[PDB]
Structure 1
Amino acid sequence: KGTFKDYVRDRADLNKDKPVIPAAALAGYTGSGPIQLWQFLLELLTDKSCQSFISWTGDGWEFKLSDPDEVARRWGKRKNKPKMNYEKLSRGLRYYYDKNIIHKTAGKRYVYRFVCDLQSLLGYTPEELHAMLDVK
């Protein structure tokens, strides 16, 4: 039976995984208001504890979805959309291909790549972050 003081202390000592690019903070910076799906993928991609169902392939801003539905799940629980499946999220990607935000690598299945200038936006180089995330 611990107090709030113990609760905070325990949280500071246990759950330790801060994404380098918080989708929320990013929406503020860019002033996009409501969190965007492409901004969310970045947060996950910048959060080690997510390298299970999503990570950088090592080639530039190229990333792959090891477990698509997982990203589709969290995305739903993050935007109060408990009705978010794998397709309702794969439809937003096409919109991203046309607006040239995210693309799909030829000769893959769930491999994608940011084609927008994230270096000038985020301030990080692809290779830089890869290191901060122990990318292999």
Structure 2
Amino acid sequence: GSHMRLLWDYVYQLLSDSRYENFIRWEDKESKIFRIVDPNGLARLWGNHKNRTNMTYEKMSRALRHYYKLNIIRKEPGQRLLFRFMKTPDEIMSGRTDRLEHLESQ
């Protein structure tokens, strides 16, 4: 495509498709809540998307940790790989992940 997906932008695509629901899945689509079902598998998707060898779940979690501050994704109380989108892409693209587009290009 012409538009590269961010890590959070990527999970959306993975979230809505079943072939990835083993790596990640909506827990509550309309609440924008998702569980990372298999982060190891999911990160290989991430590295697959960005065409990187050294892309691990650690690398993905870095992005997530950054997304929290930038009011993108949040972390729930108690669960492991559960995450809730603080905002939706339309809202997030209002400057929050503007800088992000530049680092998540690699």
* Residues 1:114 and 2:69 aligned together: no
Where 1:56 maps in the other structure, the secondary structure is strand
Tell me the distance in 2 between the aligned counterparts of 1:52 and 1:77. 16
**1:35 counterpart = 2:2:** no
Q: How many residues align?
A: 90
Q: CA deviation at 1:88?
A: 1.5
With over 3 angstroms needed to count, the CA separation of the structure-2 counterparts of 1:117 and 1:58, relative to structure 1, is closer
Q: Unmatched 5+ residue regions in structure 2?
A: 92-106
Flag the structure with larger Rg. 1
Partner of 2:28, secondary structure, is: coil
Note the residue ranges of structure 1 that are not aligned, 5 or more in a row. Answer: 1-23, 28-33, 123-136
Cα distance, 1:61 vs structure 2: 0.7
- The Cα shift of 1:106 comes to 0.7
Q: Give the residue type in structure 2 aligned to 1:53.
A: F
Within 2, Cα distance between the matches of 1:62 and 1:110?
11
Return the structure number with greater relative CO, CA threshold 8 A, min gap 6.
2
Structure 1 stretches of 4+ moved >3 Å: none
The answer for the alignment partner of 2:50 in structure 1 is: 79
SS of the counterpart of 2:34? strand
Q: Residue 56 in 1 paired to residue 34 in 2?
A: no
Q: Percent identity?
A: 39
Q: Which amino acid aligns with 1:39?
A: D
* Among candidates 101, 105, 122, match of residue 76 of structure 2: 105
